[PDB]
Structure 1
Amino acid sequence: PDSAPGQAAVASAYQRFEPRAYLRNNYAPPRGDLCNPNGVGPWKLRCLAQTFATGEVSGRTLIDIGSGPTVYQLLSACSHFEDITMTDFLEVNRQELGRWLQEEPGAFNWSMYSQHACLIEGKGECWQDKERQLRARVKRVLPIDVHQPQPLGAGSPAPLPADALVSAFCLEAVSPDLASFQRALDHITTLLRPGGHLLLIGALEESWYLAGEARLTVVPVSEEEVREALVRSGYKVRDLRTYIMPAHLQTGVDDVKGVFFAWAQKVG
């Protein structure tokens, strides 16, 4: 009933979120080992690539929900949208992205992800070009809070409503419980036009993960709880797949048991 408390714990916890530690924990090897086809990184990129390869997900505007300090989730997307908004709750994540946008050396190096996306897209694109295009297409980086009824605030810059949403490992990671998760899904759904698509990636049955000193709390969800929430929010589920976390990728940075990928289309 009372949402403020939980949301408050969440905002408090994320004050210690350390972008570099999170980058190290989830995007450096072994999880970041793009050479193993059976690994989670490759599975994620594959889900994204194949979905965009249908030609079915297009438009002018895309919004990435809770980008954090990562851009891989946009590698396959960025050829299908002119205008891309990135977003995060934390300024420090926003600056990280700033560093990559400016093509700075101190920036996290995504080039293995870029190359791998080029490889699986099968268009013989070099990664430098992929990166140049993503950089061109990211039109803004915005503060966001998915617990607000207007997640971007009122009279935001973002071209609304968007043609498509992307969101990876955000909702479940900032929702104390399932009902909060559902509301979070409801709030971002206001930003999507009817007939628009949502690509949702996330952890299955996770209760915690580490990002430096910060040990943050996650609502454990199942594939079925994810399908229901999507239906509940007004989506047709077009695709929902499950990756089971291999013991060797279960590194102690979290208690994640699997990863889900959902392609959902909002009812018009």
Structure 2
Amino acid sequence: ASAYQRFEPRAYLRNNYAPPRGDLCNPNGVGPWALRCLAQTFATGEVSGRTLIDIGSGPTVYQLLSACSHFEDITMTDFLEVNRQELGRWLQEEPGAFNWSMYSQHACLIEGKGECWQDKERQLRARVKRVLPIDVHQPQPLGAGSPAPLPADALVSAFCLEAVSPDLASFQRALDHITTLLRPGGHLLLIGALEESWYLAGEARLTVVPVSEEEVREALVRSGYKVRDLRTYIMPAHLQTGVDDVKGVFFAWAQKV
């Protein structure tokens, strides 16, 4: 918790979204696999509506590339002021923003609608109406007077919950907490670290709750979801870089009610 105070966005970004973990050329990498999961899910046309909320966005945008064309009102969030500012830098095309163009181009490539990557980033930037502070540890994650439309038609969260929970029980609560923001029948797209206990973000050393696919599955069910899809990407040896001890990555498409 207080460890997130030393959390450096730039260090987080190069540890996870820059080579080798960031390479998108090899189809066997984690990046290609994750964008595929997201793109395919939205391609079924079943995950749709008007508003969407991204839980604990951190300083990344890749988790919304395929999503942005299905929701006109997008709300991004994060606990740390520093991450919200890193997002602004990219959203406002300000100086020193992280370059996600490779991810955009790959999203367009995977989506196969012949869209150019500039049009993709243009649309995402347009639909992101706000970058709000948030705390999944609060029964009301966003708060009282949330400028964000509620209940949202859909939610997206990547690598957040397990990274802010010390144990399985906390994980469940945080999931119950954010679940309240979702409209019954709505959809949840959850991505996270499998069996990880720590990860570095510069001077910050964060503790993580090691979870398994079945634990995630069971937790989604407990929060009142109907697991539409749950996949696992096992982390290959060469993506084991010393920035954490993650064993794999999971993708979950869950529906509320």
If the length of structure 1 is used for normalisation, what is the TM-score?
A: 0.95
- Name the CA distance, whole Å, in 2 between partners of 1:17 and 1:149: 24
Superimposed CA distance per residue, residues 220-243 of structure 1 (whole angstroms, 9 cap, x where no aligned partner):
000000001100000000000000
Please report the RMSD computed on the Cα atoms of aligned residues, expressed in angstroms: 0.5
- Name the CA distance, whole Å, in 2 between partners of 1:16 and 1:177: 21
* Matched residue SS, 2:162: helix
- Name the CA distance, whole Å, in 2 between partners of 1:18 and 1:28: 15
* Matched residue SS, 2:68: helix
Unpaired segments of 5 or more residues in structure 1?
1-10
Structure 1 residue 25: Cα displacement = 0.3
Structure 1 residue 104: Cα displacement = 1.9
* Matched residue SS, 2:233: strand
Residue 217 of structure 1 is matched in structure 2 by 207
* Matched residue SS, 1:81: coil
Residue 121 of structure 2 is matched in structure 1 by 131
- Name the CA distance, whole Å, in 1 between partners of 2:64 and 2:95: 20
Structure 1 residue 112: Cα displacement = 0.2
* Matched residue SS, 1:77: coil
Instruction: Write out aligned runs for 1:38-187 (5 A).
Output: 38-187=28-177
Superimposed CA distance per residue, residues 108-155 of structure 1 (whole angstroms, 9 cap, x where no aligned partner):
000000000000000010000000000000000000000000000112
Superimposed CA distance per residue, residues 200-247 of structure 1 (whole angstroms, 9 cap, x where no aligned partner):
000000000000011100000000000011000000000000000000
- Name the CA distance, whole Å, in 2 between partners of 1:13 and 1:254: 15
Structure 1 residue 265: Cα displacement = 0.2
- Name the CA distance, whole Å, in 1 between partners of 2:92 and 2:69: 20
- Name the CA distance, whole Å, in 1 between partners of 2:232 and 2:197: 18
Structure 1 residue 176: Cα displacement = 0.7
* Matched residue SS, 2:48: coil
- Name the CA distance, whole Å, in 2 between partners of 1:217 and 1:211: 11
Structure 1 residue 105: Cα displacement = 3.3
Structure 1 residue 177: Cα displacement = 0.6
Aligned residues: 257
* Matched residue SS, 2:27: coil
Structure 1 residue 160: Cα displacement = 0.2
- Name the CA distance, whole Å, in 2 between partners of 1:26 and 1:37: 17
Identity %: 100
* Matched residue SS, 2:7: coil
* Matched residue SS, 2:140: coil
- Name the CA distance, whole Å, in 1 between partners of 2:249 and 2:96: 30
Unpaired segments of 5 or more residues in structure 2?
none
Residue 188 of structure 2 is matched in structure 1 by 198
Q: Which moved more, 1:102-111 or 1:63-72?
A: 102-111
Structure 1 residue 183: Cα displacement = 0.2
- Name the CA distance, whole Å, in 2 between partners of 1:236 and 1:53: 19
- Name the CA distance, whole Å, in 1 between partners of 2:200 and 2:137: 22
- Name the CA distance, whole Å, in 1 between partners of 2:183 and 2:162: 23
Superimposed CA distance per residue, residues 154-189 of structure 1 (whole angstroms, 9 cap, x where no aligned partner):
121110000000000000000011000000000000
- Name the CA distance, whole Å, in 2 between partners of 1:104 and 1:122: 29
Runs of 4+ residues over 6 Å off in structure 1: none
* Matched residue SS, 1:155: coil
